[PDB]
Symmetry: C3
């Protein structure tokens, strides 16, 4: 009841962590602070609140991924509805856990403000993604203060999937979206310059083409891409044609800036939770990996969860799904 | 509690309706899809929640209006406080009823986002009208999706009465208001191009004069006017002088665009709920009808409710008030 | 439950007050309506809700200040969290009391919308200060309507302390802040032109220098300054050097406009609640008073409360603190 006695916030204790290199942006690539080229390779897990509700929010989940799936990265998709439901303090308290767990295993975190829609009009694909410019600024202000000088937390993914859904959510406008991303970047950099902001384009984070002529005018950033199988629609389905379409929409970005494909994956058209644009016969697997390997692109597969689709696992014993078994072997081999 | 299992929204079932012509805009008039000129003539009823609270939300209300009062149109003034209080899902569920009832009787609906104030500053005449740009966009996004390809729902009245109340609510600015209406129109047209947006000017939807030089730059729209008796203030009270003042503020619009007078009416200065600007000795009745008949203007009288003023009815047995008896005979004769 | 029966607001009854001169702006000074030069000299008390919670919201508090401390002014720092917690109606009801108490004692009120942060981005130093542009407009709309033509309420301090905290809250931008203050001023002046708006600059209301080239383009305003001891940081701590630095940041304003230092004070570096920028050995006391007396600057010391720091009193028996005893004698002598 005494609002005047509500404490000012605290910062994560950097001394609680074991030594871990910082990742940074240099030209079109990520490097570690030993100067060696770095690639984020890993997975999304579900929202922290979803996992807590079935007691699945545990270090054992991070251990499974690091020890058996070859990941060096986990993406945490923080859904705004969950942020509000747990409340900032409780949610950050659990992010703290993820930081200690990831640090101990030598892996990195992407913190993703996981909304879908058009932030300038504050209209969204679904209420679970509902937010405001104000709440979005405040999330990043709180996150940047708390995790200042923390190497484990490597990437701040500002807004998961910008889309206007055919302009039903607003009129998509690059200038307006660019300015808003630059405004978030300035808030972040005023508080911690060692973090990497990750910026997304339109069409559910698929279309980076506006940066050919109007890139975000800030250094040290990377760009997101969500190249699901059915985004590119060539008439003849083969490597060359998919490669050319990927090149035009997002791939070109990797020539100049680092790119993280923070969501990608597939399930069979008659498989679990099959929906556009993630339906595929499986050939997309080797194709997207070949393309990303050629261009040096980083990635986090969606999703290491047995309820959310497309799944990487069929149960909480970690039985791999089709795409799970595929990506698991890709990541284990890349780690070698 | 499982926010991730909240369903995506559904659309009204168009097959549940009996055949009914669409109304559309052609030049300065409305036509039906048989190509015949159409005029909206009817009434406002009270907010859906108000009616539900005294069990007055019933098909029998629509039957009374269609069978005995000569209406082809009902305006539903959806008050934002009621939208929030029932919640969108429950409110839309009741709008669905109104659609089936209206369809069955061959009459049409105007859906009116019933706020009073200045949306660009989000300041209002009374808390019952309180809203935000965000909530307003979301209302229209939900409405347009749900009632796609539904002929019964003919008009989307974006914001009932713009006013700054002497600039106490903000600085009235046509450019800013025009742009915001165009932004709502684009959201709407991206989702359903068969609906007619209705746009209002300042001075509680009375002053359309800014459209002489700066009309909304979108096709297929109509303009609202709320020509209450005391809005025009001629020194000599007669047909000619009122006609000239109405001509300058709003009437001229009917030469180029269709106009719906979505609120109008009077009560005696010593009558029930008598207040500026609705006080009149009764001579306004024949005068506004003559003027509207001359210019082809559509209208919905305020209000077919015995509690809200000025009333068209004294009780829920539909005993006509002065203005009720007047307009009832006008509408019955026009129907012939 | 009947939202349609929620009453429209009422205005403070001016006939309940005893006769009291209005204060107004003329050039760089305040005058009373007898034409005599006026200086606001007094104190802040704590937020109304804080005082109510320990039954300290009482006329006896105002009597103590007027009869024994030589004040002609009390600043009420209305914290947005408290405004929401009591609710507008209950909060205004208590402001009404303050008005009657102050009027009876012949003293004046500064109503201060007591937030700290950057309103254009709606990001703040602490949640107790959290607000929005919408809530801020609405507060001033309600305040101006209610206290129309009330002499006792002399100053409307629009936003206590603008700051971006190193641009962690947003990019500080004078043009944007100037425009927003002008927008609030226009809402206020449309409703009551007899009140004095008080505008603040950046760096927690310390830096008025942008008004050298871009002053708020409205008449009848005054400017705020919060010249805490440690704001100016001369290497050699003496009158001349502090005076020059105060001159450059805020003092110059008093040559052209009236200035109220609505927050100032000190405590010993090892005293109660000692924090930057209020730590001082006591020499700031005579120095800031000399400077303000030279320039004709008005002031309200922070804070006449035994819990909030730096205190003017050690207990609710009004035992003076160091700064309390100092300012008490300054104000008693100035009153003579
Ligand atoms: O996290 C909660 C929830 O997530 C579910 O997965 C989401 C995905 O996170 C999201 O990327 C996906 O977005 C789809 C969208 O649904 C499609 O409608 C849209 O389709 C586009 C297509 O991309 C275009 O190429 C095509 O031409 O047009 C259509 C639009 O008509 O594509 C985007 C991605 O690009 O939505 C998913 C769910 O709807 C999980 O499945 C669920 O289990 C989780 O609980
Ligand atoms: O729906 C809830 C509630 O509605 C009540 O009716 C509302 C009307 O819906 C609304 O149009 C009306 O607005 C008035 C406003 O009150 C007047 O102050 C204003 O007066 C203007 C005038 O129009 C100008 O011409 C004149 O020069 O200046 C004055 C301003 O000083 O006029 C507008 C309409 O133009 O407000 C009504 C109630 O206040 C029902 O009466 C009630 O029963 C319902 O519950
Ligand atoms: O009302 C509730 C609460 O108030 C507390 O007092 C507040 C003051 O009202 C407020 O003015 C003060 O703001 C400080 C801020 O805390 C400092 O961080 C900041 O320091 C600046 C400095 O001013 C610059 O000159 C310097 O160069 O940089 C630093 C920034 O790093 O200075 C501002 C004022 O200028 O905050 C106080 C509390 O934090 C009461 O103390 C408390 O009891 C009440 O409950
Ligand atoms: Cl898009
Ligand atoms: Cl107006
Ligand atoms: Cl600042
Ligand atoms: Mg970091
Ligand atoms: Mg329709
Ligand atoms: Mg006053």
């Amino acid at each position: 009841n005494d609002w005047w006695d509500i404490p000012y916030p605290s910062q994560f204790d950097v001394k609680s962590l074991k030594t871990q290199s910082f990742i940074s942006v240099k030209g079109n690539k990520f490097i570690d602070d030993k100067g060696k080229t770095f690639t984020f390779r890993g997975v999304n897990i579900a929202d922290t609140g979803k996992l807590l509700s079935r007691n699945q929010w545990q270090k054992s989940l991070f251990e499974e991924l690091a020890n058996n799936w070859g990941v060096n990265t986990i993406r945490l998709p923080i859904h705004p509805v969950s942020w509000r439901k747990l409340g900032p303090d409780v949610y950050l308290g659990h992010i703290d856990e993820a930081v200690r767990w990831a640090n101990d295993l030598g892996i990195y975190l992407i913190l993703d403000w996981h909304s879908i829609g058009y932030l300038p009009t504050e209209q969204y694909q679904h209420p679970m993604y509902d937010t405001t410019i104000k709440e979005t600024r405040d999330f990043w202000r709180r996150i940047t203060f708390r995790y200042q000088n923390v190497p484990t937390v490597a990437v701040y993914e500002l807004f998961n999937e910008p889309t206007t859904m055919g302009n039903t959510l607003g009129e998509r406008n690059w200038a307006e979206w660019k300015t808003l991303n630059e405004s978030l970047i300035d808030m972040i950099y005023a508080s911690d310059k060692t973090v990497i902001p990750l910026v997304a384009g339109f069409n559910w984070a698929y279309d980076l083409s506006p940066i050919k002529k109007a890139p975000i005018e800030r250094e040290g950033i990377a760009y997101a891409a969500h190249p699901y199988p059915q985004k590119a629609k060539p008439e003849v389905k083969n490597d060359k044609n998919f490669f050319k379409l990927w090149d035009e929409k997002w791939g070109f970005a990797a020539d100049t800036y680092p790119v993280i494909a923070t969501q990608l994956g597939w399930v069979q058209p008659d498989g679990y939770g099959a929906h556009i644009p993630v339906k595929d016969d499986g050939s997309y697997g080797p194709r997207i990996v070949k393309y990303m390997q050629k261009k040096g692109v980083s990635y986090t597969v969606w999703v290491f969860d047995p309820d959310w689709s497309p799944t990487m696992i069929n149960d909480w014993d970690f039985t791999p799904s089709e795409q799970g078994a595929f990506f698991k072997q890709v990541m284990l081999e890349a780690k070698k």
